Amino acid sequence: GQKVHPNGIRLGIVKPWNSTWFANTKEFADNLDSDFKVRQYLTKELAKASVSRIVIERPAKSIRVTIHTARPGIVIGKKGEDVEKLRKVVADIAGVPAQINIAEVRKPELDAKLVADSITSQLERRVMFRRAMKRAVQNAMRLGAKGIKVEVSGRLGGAEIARTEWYREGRVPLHTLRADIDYNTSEAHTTYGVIGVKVWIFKGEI
Amino acid sequence: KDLETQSQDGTFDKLTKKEALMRTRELEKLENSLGGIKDMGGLPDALFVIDADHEHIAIKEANNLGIPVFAIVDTNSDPDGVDFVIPGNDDAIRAVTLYLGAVAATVREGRS
RNA sequence: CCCGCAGAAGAAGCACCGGCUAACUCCGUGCCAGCAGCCGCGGUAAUACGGAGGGUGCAAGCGUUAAUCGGAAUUACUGGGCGUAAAGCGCACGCAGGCGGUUUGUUAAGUCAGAUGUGAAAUCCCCGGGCUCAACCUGGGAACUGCAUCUGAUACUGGCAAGCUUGAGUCUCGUAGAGGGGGGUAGAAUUCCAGGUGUAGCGGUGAAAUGCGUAGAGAUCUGGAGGAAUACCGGUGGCGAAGGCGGCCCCCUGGACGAAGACUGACGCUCAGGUGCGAAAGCGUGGGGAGCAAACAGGAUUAGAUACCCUGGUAGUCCACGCCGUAAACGAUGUCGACUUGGAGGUUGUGCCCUUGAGGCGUGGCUUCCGGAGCUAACGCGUUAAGUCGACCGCCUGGGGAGUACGGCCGCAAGGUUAAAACUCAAAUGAAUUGACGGGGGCCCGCACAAGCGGUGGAGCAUGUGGUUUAAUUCGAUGCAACGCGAAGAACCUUACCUGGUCUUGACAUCCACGGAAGUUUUCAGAGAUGAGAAUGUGCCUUCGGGAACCGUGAGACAGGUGCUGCAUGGCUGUCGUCAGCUCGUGUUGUGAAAUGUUGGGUUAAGUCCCGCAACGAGCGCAACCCUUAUCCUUUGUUGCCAGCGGUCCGGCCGGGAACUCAAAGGAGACUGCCAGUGAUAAACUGGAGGAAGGUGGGGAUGACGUCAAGUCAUCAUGGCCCUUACGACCAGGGCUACACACGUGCUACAAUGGCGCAUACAAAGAGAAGCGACCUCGCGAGAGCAAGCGGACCUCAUAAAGUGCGUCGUAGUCCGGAUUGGAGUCUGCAACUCGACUCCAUGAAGUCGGAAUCGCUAGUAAUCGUGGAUCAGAAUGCCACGGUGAAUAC
Predict the structure, then answer these.
(1) Of the N and C termini of chain A, which has fewer Cβ atoms inside 10 Å?
(2) Which nucleotides of chain C have an atom under 7 angstroms from any protein CB?
(3) If you write DSSP's letter for every residue of B37-100 in order, what string do you get?
(4) Nucleotide minimizing C1' to CA distance for residue A189
């Protein structure tokens, strides 16, 4: 449209990568398919687990799955059973042993991915969007976030004509590279087509 | 208040003198504006005003609040915005000297 | 009316459900069927149409229509309006009519009090009563809002009488004035006529033409003839009822206003009908006719020009006497009277203090502007009121029809005045607000123009598009912001399009039943898909009635769809525009839409910064933060480098060295930081120093709120609707490359700052493992053989090209140019015909700087030379990077 992906532009400077590893020009292709494949799987199983980001590091043919999650209880199951269950297939997809390692998140409502899910969650259950949308914004201020911005679009509220209503509280300087802005996006599959949600958080300042 | 601390003892060289100067001249801005009022922190209960011509702006505002006003109104002033009118000169230099000191003593003892 | 009998057995529809208005969803149909009191609903997702369910209202009735009233204060007596929304007669005089100052007495009409006569009963109302209640019947009262008579009251209005003076009017002395009619008169100027002087233009316009002129104009001088208007003074200055009225003098005459008193004694204010006056134009009779000028003509302008412009020009405009009776006849504001803060002015009288010095202190008449309260829809009005009241008169009742028709009246006529209806619409209209826009104003910016350089449009070829053709020329993009675009690369593939051949639980996914390792090997028919066999292997755990696997067959859910709608959508993108703007909080002004902040003075690349200020703040943007580039220090020294030192096949090649190049990390440095000057001692701007670099040092990345219901359903995701022995799937060949034709974007040219031959000099960046490939051998060559080294500062791709020295051709369609064409070929790939690139020999066209028109560019840029990379087997003049060479001009 007009704006560049907030995450991408600050990668080199502030926000670190998500699939951190190395591979010569030859095998580069294959790893991408593999690393992508597990990412697809984790979304498919840990959906009802509130998983924000999943790191895929590969040192010396060792597929490392670091998951920055919210609810370890749901992820580990009992005594870790679920994790080591996941360990099997993941190691199989990547073709090499996989030490699945979790990472609990400080504030579930301060990560862009997770919150967007909540907005999506309520819209996936017939919740009046303005109440749903605004609830998250109050939360960012109530958790101390320096700023927040949200934005939904589509057939919102069952309307025929599609419209895009956004919201804003707090300082969100997107043009300042120095500052860390946890931005993320999620869909919203309702009977009224797909609704899209975007959320920004001026979490970091430098 | 914060800057007042930041100025006499606080940060004055952290970035560069040029912008350190910025806060200083900014301190001057807030200085002439909220200088002699910073300690109030609430709402006053009496507005003693020298001229009603230049300061009708505040009078109406004070009148708009549950507050009494005392104006040294002049021949070209509207007394209808005042409560306890004080006719006479306002702009004469020596005039206020007589005025304020008279008020100064009354207010000095008036805490009895 | 009462009693017994019998079984809940005989006994509830109607309208509406978008809003008004109580009450909702689903399906069906698709600007059709329809609906409807109104606004409006229906376009393939209808709460408004039809049905179903649920439900809201009323009930033996419930909806529709019609009709009266209500709401409608949209006929206003109670109870409206007329500055701009409909509405002040054009102004005035004035009979009837309406109303009328003040004092006293008087009468008692109107008015008031009481009583009386009457005001039919019924009905209504009040309290009772009677039918099982009620409806209904009915008792007594109240009321019958009125009218007539009689008696008291006498304030207010009326009749009468007598006054008073503050209303009105008269007189005396003065004042200012474009007040009106009549009679003379002065000067400037224009036109014409008569001469003198004198000579090729004059006049007119955007330019020009018509026209005037060598018969001698225009110009200039003198004389004369006339008609009309009065420069300067001249003034939101004066007079007049209004229309109007302007040099000067005279005559006749109206009105206004003032000082001071005298006098009459309410004699008033308004006013239907009526009478008079009443701009310009127009009309009639007779004059006058300079200038100006409808009509008219010619000449231009123009697509046309019955106009705007120019040259002429009649009626008219001027006078006399009559008529016409209309104007945005307008402070769009009827006349008269009273009361209610102020300020600055102008003009005309007049009393007083000093005229002591162009003055100061007061009181009256008219008039201009600004604004208080208040009023008002707002704008604004505002002691000259649209303020607060009183008297009287005119007039309005949605817009259009229509100020018209008809008739009356008046008119010489043109017309005027008086003044509708049917019909049609659901608005019309005013004030103000936010914007957008202006062939409106001011301020500023941008390769926007200008100053220049080089291009396209003309040629050939490449590529894309429209059109055409076709079995198919897949589908999408199609003002700027599509047209070397999606496509970073169509022979098969790709591929969605066509013909023909095939399967249809399928090419792919999961679950079921059963059998079979998987897989490898080989042959036939077929264009291929596939159909037909023949063999081999028979592998992991034992519930060993089977795993898990991969394959085959059959069933059923489905799988799949490059099928439609980007106007159902997310995601992603372009453009306005890297333009400097876009907004919110609280407060404040406004009935409110909103405004203020964001405006103003300076300033800047910039709502950047300072100051001012009913605004104070803040956010998003601008900037900075990030990468690269220009300089240096420090650190490391390979496969990179070579100064000071030795060995050399003088090759950084071998020791050796860590200076330098370079490479790579970390920092330094540049911030108006310093000086002078200007400027508000502010921001900032101009120049200078030092400095590698100077005013965001270059460049890139970065794209605000929103706009185009802009692109995309075909990258992907995805609501609907649609196909589903098909629009799904496999296959061979073809098509996408077709070609009377048009446009776009490029490359090569058209040459001598140029072509060709020989030798020779100087780059950066990047790629490379079914990949790049030297050296060497063969060939004229594209390539072939063999092939170290390198998955990489070492090796390879890979010999830089322009350039430079020399020879040479000598302005030709040529030693230019290179398409087209024949032959012989190499490589790639199963395969080169439709349809690959490259080489060799031969061939040799168009084209000699390109119409109207139109694009890019402000410094290492334009232009020009060469190079590499992604896509990819092969397939670049495209796209994306690199370096060489190196301008012009900016008032």
Answers:
(1) N
(2) 45, 568-577, 588-589, 611, 614, 617-627, 671-673, 701-707, 709-710, 717-720, 768-769, 791-792
(3) GTTT-S--S-EEES-SSTTHHHHHHHHHTT--EEEEE-TTS-GGG-SS-EES-SS-HHHHHHHH
(4) C718
**Rounded Cα distance, A195 and A157, in Å:** 10
Maximal CA-CA distance, chain B: 55
Which residues touch A15 (CB under 8 Å, ≥6 apart)?
A7, A180
| Cα B35 to Cα A120: distance, rounded to the nearest angstrom | 51
- Nearest nucleotide to A156 by CA–C1' distance? C569
Please tell me the total number of residues recorded for chain A in this structure.
Answer: 206
How is the beta sheet containing A184-189 ordered, strand by strand?
A163-170, A147-154, A194-201, A184-189
- Angle, vertex CA A168, rays to CA A53 and CA A126, nearest 5: 70
3-class DSSP state for residue A139? helix
- Residue A65 structure tokens: 């799955």
CATH 3.30.1140.32 at A107-206, yes or no:
yes
B36 to A24, B1, B63: CA distances (angstroms): 70, 12, 22
Fold match flag (A16-106 vs A107-206):
no
Technique behind this structure? Answer: cryo-EM
Largest CA distance in chain A: 54
Amino acid at A16: P
Question: Which of the nucleotides lies closest to A3 (Cα–C1')?
Answer: C703
What CATH number has the domain spanning A16-106?
3.30.300.20
Residue B67's φ and ψ, nearest 5 degrees, are -140, 140
The C-alpha atoms of residue B39 and residue A47 are separated, in whole angstroms, by 56
Both structure tokens of A165 = 């209503």
**Residue at the smallest CA–C1' distance to nucleotide C625:** A178
The DSSP letter of residue A96 is S
Named by the residue before each, gaps in chain B exceeding 2.5 A from C to N are: none
Q: How far apart (Å, rounded) are the C-alpha atoms in residues A160 and A148? A: 29
Residue type at position A48: K
